[PDB]
């Protein structure tokens, strides 16, 4: 599988089972859903009738009066009563198998290739940590909404990309499927390709 490069107009040999796999939408949808469920914090609670501040006394007697039977003022049918099925803090994280996660990444990286949403360059550096320099470089590349994966830790690039919301900069380890989809273009360093292909076999 060969990936032509943008700047030097060379090639780069990759695994076809990685970058030419057919797009398995149901797998990718499962993984993207589980990622967005993993982001989910799940911090809420309501009060039951057990937890409502009150007293456990019958507001009136059982019979004799003309009113309906009642046992508790904390009743979930009363105003300022309990919630019937009051919630607890719960964990919404799903399990994704490892081979399913890699199948999804190999699917959407193959799809970004088929959609020409993947750009491969040898190097992507900014000299000084300036967002003005980064916006100039991306304008020269004709890029606005982009993910930038670099096989190294470039701090000037992180700082120059921190203020731009259209732009995100990742390590090759810190890539995610939802960000590979949510961004319009993806720029990979060829070293970052070598690391991604090695991780993903």
């Amino acid at each position: 599988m060969e990936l032509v490069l943008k700047d030097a107009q060379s090639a780069l040999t990759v695994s076809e089972t990685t970058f030419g796999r057919d797009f398995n939408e149901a797998l990718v949808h499962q993984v993207v859903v589980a990622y967005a469920a993993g982001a989910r914090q799940g911090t809420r609670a309501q009060k039951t009738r057990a937890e409502v501040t009150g007293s456990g006394k019958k507001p009136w007697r059982q019979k004799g009066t003309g009113r309906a039977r009642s046992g508790s003022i904390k009743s979930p049918i009363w105003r300022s009563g309990g919630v019937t099925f009051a919630a607890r803090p719960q964990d919404h994280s799903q399990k994704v198998n490892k081979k399913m996660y890699r199948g999804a990444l190999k699917s959407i990286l193959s799809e970004l290739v088929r959609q020409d949403r993947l750009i491969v360059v040898e190097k992507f550096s900014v000299e000084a940590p300036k967002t003005k320099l980064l916006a100039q470089k991306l304008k020269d590349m004709a890029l606005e909404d982009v993910l930038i994966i670099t096989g190294e830790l470039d701090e000037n690039l992180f700082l120059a990309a921190r203020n731009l919301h259209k732009v995100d900069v990742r390590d090759a380890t810190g890539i995610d499927p939802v960000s590979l989809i949510a961004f319009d273009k993806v720029v990979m360093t060829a070293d970052a390709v070598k690391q991604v292909e090695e991780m993903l076999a």
């Binding site: 009136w60 004799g64 009066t65 009113r67």
Partner: peptide, 27 residues
């Protein structure tokens, strides 16, 4: 006044009612 209503409910039922008013055991 629903607080003077508290009185109303709290004790126009705690008045308790007197009782049935026909000396009849339907026995």
């Amino acid at each position: 006044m629903s607080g003077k209503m508290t009185g109303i409910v709290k004790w126009f039922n705690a008045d308790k009612g007197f009782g049935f008013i026909t000396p009849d055991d339907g026995s």
